[PDB]
Amino acid sequence: GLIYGNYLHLEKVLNAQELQSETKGNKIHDEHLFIITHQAYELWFKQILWELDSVREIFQNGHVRDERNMLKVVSRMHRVSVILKLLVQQFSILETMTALDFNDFREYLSPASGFQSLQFRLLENKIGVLQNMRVPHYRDNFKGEENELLLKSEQEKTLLELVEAWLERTPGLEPHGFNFWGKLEKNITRGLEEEEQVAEFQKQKEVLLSLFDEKRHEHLLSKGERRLSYRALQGALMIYFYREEPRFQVPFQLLTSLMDIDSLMTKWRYNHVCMVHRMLGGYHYLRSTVSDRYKVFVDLFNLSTYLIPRHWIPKMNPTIHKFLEH
Amino acid sequence: GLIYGNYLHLEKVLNAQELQSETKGNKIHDEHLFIITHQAYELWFKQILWELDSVREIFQNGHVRDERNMLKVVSRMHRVSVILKLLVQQFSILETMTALDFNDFREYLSPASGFQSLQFRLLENKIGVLQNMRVPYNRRHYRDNFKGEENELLLKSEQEKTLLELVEAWLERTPGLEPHGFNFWGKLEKNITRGLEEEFIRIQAESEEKEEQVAEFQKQKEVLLSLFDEKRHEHLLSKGERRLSYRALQGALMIYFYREEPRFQVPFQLLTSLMDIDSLMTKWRYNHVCMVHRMLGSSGYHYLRSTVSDRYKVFVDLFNLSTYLIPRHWIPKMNPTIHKFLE
Amino acid sequence: GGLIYGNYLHLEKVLNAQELQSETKGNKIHDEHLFIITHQAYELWFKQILWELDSVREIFQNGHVRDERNMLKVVSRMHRVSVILKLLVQQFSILETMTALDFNDFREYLSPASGFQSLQFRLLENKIGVLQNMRVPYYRDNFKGEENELLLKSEQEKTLLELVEAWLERTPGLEPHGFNFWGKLEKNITRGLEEEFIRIQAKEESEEKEEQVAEFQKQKEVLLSLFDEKRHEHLLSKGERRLSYRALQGALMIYFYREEPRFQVPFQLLTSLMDIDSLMTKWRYNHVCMVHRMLGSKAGSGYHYLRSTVSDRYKVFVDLFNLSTYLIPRHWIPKMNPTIHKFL
Amino acid sequence: GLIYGNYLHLEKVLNAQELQSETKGNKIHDEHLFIITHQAYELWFKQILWELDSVREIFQNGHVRDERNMLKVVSRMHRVSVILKLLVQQFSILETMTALDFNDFREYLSPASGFQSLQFRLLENKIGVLQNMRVPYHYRDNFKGEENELLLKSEQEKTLLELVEAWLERTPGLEPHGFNFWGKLEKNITRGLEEEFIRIQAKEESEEKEEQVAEFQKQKEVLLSLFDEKRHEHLLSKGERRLSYRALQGALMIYFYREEPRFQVPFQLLTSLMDIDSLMTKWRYNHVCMVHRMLGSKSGYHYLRSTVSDRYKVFVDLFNLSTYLIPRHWIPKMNPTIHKFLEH
Ligand code: HEM
Ligand code: HEM
Ligand code: HEM
Ligand code: HEM
Ligand SMILES: Fc1ccc2c(/C=C/c3nnn[nH]3)c[nH]c2c1
Ligand SMILES: Fc1ccc2c(/C=C/c3nnn[nH]3)c[nH]c2c1
Ligand SMILES: Fc1ccc2c(/C=C/c3nnn[nH]3)c[nH]c2c1
Numbered sequence A: 001g002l003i004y005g006n007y008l009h010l011e012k013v014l015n016a017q018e019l020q021s022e023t024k025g026n027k028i029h030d031e032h033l034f035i036i037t038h039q040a041y042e043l044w045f046k047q048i049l050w051e052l053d054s055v056r057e058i059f060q061n062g063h064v065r066d067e068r069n070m071l072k073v074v075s076r077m078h079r080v081s082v083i084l085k086l087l088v089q090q091f092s093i094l095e096t097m098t099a100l101d102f103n104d105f106r107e108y109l110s111p112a113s114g115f116q117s118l119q120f121r122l123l124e125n126k127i128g129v130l131q132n133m134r135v136p137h138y139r140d141n142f143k144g145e146e147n148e149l150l151l152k153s154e155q156e157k158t159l160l161e162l163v164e165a166w167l168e169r170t171p172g173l174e175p176h177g178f179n180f181w182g183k184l185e186k187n188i189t190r191g192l193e194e195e196e197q198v199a200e201f202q203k204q205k206e207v208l209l210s211l212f213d214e215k216r217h218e219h220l221l222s223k224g225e226r227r228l229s230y231r232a233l234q235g236a237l238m239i240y241f242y243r244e245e246p247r248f249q250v251p252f253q254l255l256t257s258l259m260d261i262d263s264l265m266t267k268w269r270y271n272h273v274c275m276v277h278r279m280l281g282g283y284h285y286l287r288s289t290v291s292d293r294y295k296v297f298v299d300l301f302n303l304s305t306y307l308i309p310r311h312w313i314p315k316m317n318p319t320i321h322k323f324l325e326h
Numbered sequence B: 001g002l003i004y005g006n007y008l009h010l011e012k013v014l015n016a017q018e019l020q021s022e023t024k025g026n027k028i029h030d031e032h033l034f035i036i037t038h039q040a041y042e043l044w045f046k047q048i049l050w051e052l053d054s055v056r057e058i059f060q061n062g063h064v065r066d067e068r069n070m071l072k073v074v075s076r077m078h079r080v081s082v083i084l085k086l087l088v089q090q091f092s093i094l095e096t097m098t099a100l101d102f103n104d105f106r107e108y109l110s111p112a113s114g115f116q117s118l119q120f121r122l123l124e125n126k127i128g129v130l131q132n133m134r135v136p137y138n139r140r141h142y143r144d145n146f147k148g149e150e151n152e153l154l155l156k157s158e159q160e161k162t163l164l165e166l167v168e169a170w171l172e173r174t175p176g177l178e179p180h181g182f183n184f185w186g187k188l189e190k191n192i193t194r195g196l197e198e199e200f201i202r203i204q205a206e207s208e209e210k211e212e213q214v215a216e217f218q219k220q221k222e223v224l225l226s227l228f229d230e231k232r233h234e235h236l237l238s239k240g241e242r243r244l245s246y247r248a249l250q251g252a253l254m255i256y257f258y259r260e261e262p263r264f265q266v267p268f269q270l271l272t273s274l275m276d277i278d279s280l281m282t283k284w285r286y287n288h289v290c291m292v293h294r295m296l297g298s299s300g301y302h303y304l305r306s307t308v309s310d311r312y313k314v315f316v317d318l319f320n321l322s323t324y325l326i327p328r329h330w331i332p333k334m335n336p337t338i339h340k341f342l343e
Numbered sequence C: 001g002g003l004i005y006g007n008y009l010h011l012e013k014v015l016n017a018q019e020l021q022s023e024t025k026g027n028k029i030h031d032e033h034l035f036i037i038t039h040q041a042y043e044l045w046f047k048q049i050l051w052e053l054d055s056v057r058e059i060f061q062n063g064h065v066r067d068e069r070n071m072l073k074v075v076s077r078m079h080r081v082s083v084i085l086k087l088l089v090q091q092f093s094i095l096e097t098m099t100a101l102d103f104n105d106f107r108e109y110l111s112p113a114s115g116f117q118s119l120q121f122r123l124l125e126n127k128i129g130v131l132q133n134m135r136v137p138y139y140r141d142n143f144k145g146e147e148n149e150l151l152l153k154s155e156q157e158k159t160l161l162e163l164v165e166a167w168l169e170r171t172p173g174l175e176p177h178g179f180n181f182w183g184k185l186e187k188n189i190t191r192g193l194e195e196e197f198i199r200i201q202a203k204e205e206s207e208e209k210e211e212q213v214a215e216f217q218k219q220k221e222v223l224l225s226l227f228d229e230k231r232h233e234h235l236l237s238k239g240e241r242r243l244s245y246r247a248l249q250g251a252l253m254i255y256f257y258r259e260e261p262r263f264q265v266p267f268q269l270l271t272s273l274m275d276i277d278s279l280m281t282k283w284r285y286n287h288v289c290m291v292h293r294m295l296g297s298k299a300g301s302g303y304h305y306l307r308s309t310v311s312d313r314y315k316v317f318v319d320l321f322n323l324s325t326y327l328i329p330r331h332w333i334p335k336m337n338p339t340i341h342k343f344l
Numbered sequence D: 001g002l003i004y005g006n007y008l009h010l011e012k013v014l015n016a017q018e019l020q021s022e023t024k025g026n027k028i029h030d031e032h033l034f035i036i037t038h039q040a041y042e043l044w045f046k047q048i049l050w051e052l053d054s055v056r057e058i059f060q061n062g063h064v065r066d067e068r069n070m071l072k073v074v075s076r077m078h079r080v081s082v083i084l085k086l087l088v089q090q091f092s093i094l095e096t097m098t099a100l101d102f103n104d105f106r107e108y109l110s111p112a113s114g115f116q117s118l119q120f121r122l123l124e125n126k127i128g129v130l131q132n133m134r135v136p137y138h139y140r141d142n143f144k145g146e147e148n149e150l151l152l153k154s155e156q157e158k159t160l161l162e163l164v165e166a167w168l169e170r171t172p173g174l175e176p177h178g179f180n181f182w183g184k185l186e187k188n189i190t191r192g193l194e195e196e197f198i199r200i201q202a203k204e205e206s207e208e209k210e211e212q213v214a215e216f217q218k219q220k221e222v223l224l225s226l227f228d229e230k231r232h233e234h235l236l237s238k239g240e241r242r243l244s245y246r247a248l249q250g251a252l253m254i255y256f257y258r259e260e261p262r263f264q265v266p267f268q269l270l271t272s273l274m275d276i277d278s279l280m281t282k283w284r285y286n287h288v289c290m291v292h293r294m295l296g297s298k299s300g301y302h303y304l305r306s307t308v309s310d311r312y313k314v315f316v317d318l319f320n321l322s323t324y325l326i327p328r329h330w331i332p333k334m335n336p337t338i339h340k341f342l343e344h
């Protein structure tokens, strides 16, 4: 029957290590570490793509509508975070290579770099990094079937788009139902008004009431300083404020997980930068990838700006408590 | 021009994922995670073998004799423990797979397992796990699972000099052991004999806290003086409860007690690193067990639990040197001649 | 002057709690400072774990757990406990930067204190549900006064194991006149085994066939043992099992039907309880691995007693781990008809 | 006889938890986690200060001159980075608190913050963050009395940067009358660049060749700038550099000749100082990433983001030595006399 080595196709995995330094008759020991490290990163990127495409598909084929599938969705998105956490720790292995030892084989690599990682771009695109928000261009490095896959990843529905659609259908937003948005505007307005001192309040008032300016939201959307439809934003805040309601518990975990993935991607970018500095003394472009420009779910972070006292949150009457009960 | 994908042979690495569940028309999502996890472990085992063989070679060809090479030796052995640290953390990824989800594809894997990891055995053997000290699985040797060129490589790895043997040889040549030189072992026996005598006197100044100190002293005396019983050491060597030659043990303790001496600083770091590698291997074995329990309940789970013992710690002697630690003022002083040899 | 960082955090206490016994007897040893801070950091986190754990115990004990609105809070806090324990396992890495030789220079001045006298560690063991007669010999003698009194309360008050057990007994779907999970499961496993024995007895007499019969008979014994309530009571009294028969049924109900909305977060809770058992035993194991490096095969048996705490004798939720033994093909799990899909 | 609780002054450590929310009759559960987390950070800051002051002292009192002490110095500086690694991971515990739950007790804290952490500032100062490298938002104003006095001493007493600089200036091999590292290096880089210009001007006239000439001329300008002591003084005063020209020479001597016995542990020390800078900035970055989650864009979040720059890396010079790496065969060879000087 089946043998470990054959099951895992180790005849491919463990015969993929060719030191360019050796191939030009000057073998450098540490180049082996450089190769395995990248290969391990690429195995895990493939796994992240596998989880991510499976989750994209659960939204796209409508299975997400059946709430029995939310445990699967949150598990796999959580799994992506656990993988990314290891990829952040994995830099510690490559930091055991000194700049001097790297310098002895660096010449033999030119002009290859992570800029040519197909999977890293697929991953960025599939989460929902938009091309016009990227700092300088990126797809020039790719040709043939790879250039074609990269296009599909920009055109096919992103995780951001599929989550946006789902967030728009959040229960409680219906004006002739719970009418969350109307009640919230009323309750914040009635709050506030319950007002030589600081009089900072005017700052708080401007910020909170700006939430209800749909026009400001559309302007900021088109400048790419926000990413979610106004209606998706309402669903997210509905899930935040009413997270203890049974039907919102796992959805709240999902929103938390999406923010975790943004955090860990940017931590990956930051640990990469911190190491490129040590190796080369490039370094400036990477530093500019560590900004909110590249956080696909920045809207979910910025909802913290619009937190209010508990007693302002529109109360749930027995009818709507029962709608949000499994 | 060279291309990232081509440099890394990603045409092999990223086309090595075949789900047996899919191959029999019932694809299970989590089987993909099962495969990548093993492949990642196997890439890192290959890297550990690369570091380990490079270090074995530096001892075997005599380069280690030139002390300028100790930074390289300690860096690579330290690198091995950083990789093992990640491999211990890597179990956390496979723990995101539930036993229920694993159960949906387990059938399609039979009868393969990690028992057939060639690299894991090469790694155990090359560090210096002895075949006769291994726990048997279903009353058989671990090498039955392998045939042909793989069985042959495993044999070479048992017969070729292990890291334990090469470190032992190097430890035997440690400066300061020469009876007609510093004579570390003679001075130490004298100073421990004197130190114990001074301690007995301080105590024979009665109470019940005093009586519990006499019992403790008599225990400490028996243990410390047993160090100088070369006969007991040879007996324990042959029972495999110890691994290093008596002379290698002397070198190790020389490096421990005189670690601040310039020529002993990096050697001390190396001994610390060898213990780190033993600790992290056993942590790997323990995290593997803790997870097999969660996935299966059951014997596999019992044999693995028995691999988490001092039977499998190749450098157990370096841990057990802590038993024979003594107060600072007992350690034989270094006169200006021998300070200068180590500086 | 309103509120000040130092005052808010009572840093006048926290940062004036470091007294090196080596210094107090006129022979200051540098690394003793690290020994003290490391233990103090462990004890701050033990206090936090007790805070989360007592809050969760209380939500079960006062009946608030019955309102499923509260399960997000319960799973968050139990998850938080395992995140803290993960850091406590990593925290050993700091104390491993102390050599055995450096430890040996101040060890004398500590006698006869040890972690055996950690009140909070015992409170934590007791409150999760470590049972007194399953503790390895060479524990309460070390403690006196109001500490001895708190330890007693922790043994007498309802443990997390007891409170989870009670809640697991009320799991929906166990009612014989309802979904009748246990009856349907016995029927489906009994039928499934019968179908499998027939598929096997068809095969032409061989050696591969006989090794399948031996494998089948093993599987049959294990699965059908689930329905032996008497075996379960015997194993309960030997302390090889901890959950009531009915609590075991609820746990397996939640395992098999975890995707059902009402079971999703409860499944996460069961997962978290197993995580806490895993991380406690990892804490015990990393402690052992380090005591070996510091003391060798010397007393404090020491290194040997600790090694015996790293067993399933100390896993409070062993029953949750061992449910993996009784996993069955998917198509054997009793189907949910539209009526019971709607209840969950 | 000594008791665990008493040895560790747990009567202080575990009675330092006062929830302001409870003190104003509205107890919020998660405030307890907020307090323990900060107290654990502050215990570890105290330990880092203990290691750091002990190492400062070994330089300041001349013990560092005796190379017997390098193992101690590197162990303790390595210990600092292991502690900082845990402090970076420790953010994961506070990330188990949601912004909503934080918001329920945030009001009761005003206007206290980490800006009032005495130990964080002592730590920044003692490593060698200077006044003129700080982003402006007068950090000292928050402190009064004996705390203001400690902060002053930390600015005035010799920093780790100053003490390392002094030691690096005495590095063997820099003496013009001896190995004369700097002279030989200028000669070998000048010769090496000449050989390289020739190898390039030989190549078949092309566009790939012209892009190599532009690359060479860039590399030549950068390498030769190393020997411009005037450019170094200019960059020192603009705070783009921190180390004396002579200290920089010692560092590069240790980099290129690290395998020489007397340089092995010194190389580890330089590596460790870079590790400490990396982990401090990772601490600053994980703090920022979490303040974002808790507060949004409310400056605050913007000032912290500006602390995550090379302006706060005290040993940025040690990172930037990688800019001046050269092929192995250009490094001045060591004759038998100087091989013997760098032998323990
Ligand atoms: C010594 C180690 C490393 C150095 C010095 C290094 C250096 C760099 C530099 C300078 C860049 C900017 C592009 C360029 O100039 O070519 C870059 C980009 C990149 N590197 Fe690396 N790298 C290293 C390791 C890694 C590893 C292990 C990975 C894992 C796959 C990786 C993935 C990437 C990716 C994905 C990019 C594109 C980044 C983006 O566009 O956001 N690098 N690297
Ligand atoms: C769901 C995950 C896993 C399960 C259920 C599992 C199960 C087992 C079992 C039962 C054994 C004992 C031999 C046998 O009866 O099969 C074993 C041994 C082993 N497994 Fe795993 N394993 C898992 C994951 C891994 C992974 C990811 C590795 C990575 C290399 C691995 C490496 C090994 C090795 C090397 C052995 C032989 C160990 C020894 O003899 O000391 N396993 N495994
Ligand atoms: C150098 C470090 C350490 C050494 C050598 C050490 C040694 C020991 C020993 C020998 C015991 C068994 C009882 C005895 O003979 O006195 C013990 C128990 C214990 N230690 Fe430690 N220990 C260390 C660090 C720590 C730390 C940092 C903690 C943190 C709280 C800790 C907590 C405990 C606890 C709670 C016990 C009771 C264990 C049980 O019954 O399951 N130890 N330690
Ligand atoms: C929910 C958790 C936290 C929030 C929201 C938070 C927020 C902030 C903010 C806004 C500042 C800037 C000063 C101000 O405008 O008041 C700050 C600075 C600071 N925080 Fe935090 N913080 C948190 C947790 C922590 C923790 C756990 C520590 C642990 C010691 C800490 C240490 C500091 C330090 C030292 C500063 C001064 C930073 C500098 O000058 O570079 N913070 N924090
Ligand atoms: F490549 C492989 C193949 C099978 C297993 C395995 C199987 C364990 C097992 N349990 N029951 N049957 N096999 C554990 N790791 C593996 C790696
Ligand atoms: F607060 C304390 C005091 C002593 C110890 C200790 C002593 C262990 C020991 N080994 N040999 N003698 N004492 C281990 N953890 C501790 C914590
Ligand atoms: F002792 C304290 C008190 C408050 C804070 C804090 C508050 C930050 C903040 N932002 N908005 N309101 N409070 C961050 N670290 C702290 C330590």
Ligand SMILES: C[C@](N)(Cc1c[nH]c2ccccc12)C(=O)O
Pocket: A064, A065, A066, A067, A166, A167, A168, A169, A170, A171, A239, A247, A248, A251
């Ligand atoms: C029927 C539904 N599953 C409802 C839904 C939409 N968005 C949500 C967010 C949280 C909870 C629920 C929902 C659906 O429309 O998909």
Ligand SMILES: C[C@](N)(Cc1c[nH]c2ccccc12)C(=O)O
Pocket: B064, B065, B066, B067, B170, B171, B172, B173, B174, B175, B255, B263, B264, B267
């Ligand atoms: C010349 C020598 N390198 C000496 C040697 C042997 N073992 C040691 C331990 C520590 C320091 C040195 C040694 C050699 O014989 O290898």
Ligand SMILES: C[C@](N)(Cc1c[nH]c2ccccc12)C(=O)O
Pocket: C065, C066, C067, C068, C167, C168, C169, C170, C171, C172, C254, C262, C263, C266
């Ligand atoms: C009404 C109920 N909350 C029902 C209950 C008990 N255990 C469970 C496990 C999963 C889902 C639900 C339950 C109660 O009695 O607590």
Ligand SMILES: C[C@](N)(Cc1c[nH]c2ccccc12)C(=O)O
Pocket: D064, D065, D066, D067, D167, D168, D169, D170, D171, D172, D254, D262, D263, D266
């Ligand atoms: C005698 C000496 N320890 C020499 C010294 C200074 N900096 C160094 C760096 C590496 C090796 C040595 C040194 C001293 O002058 O302190």
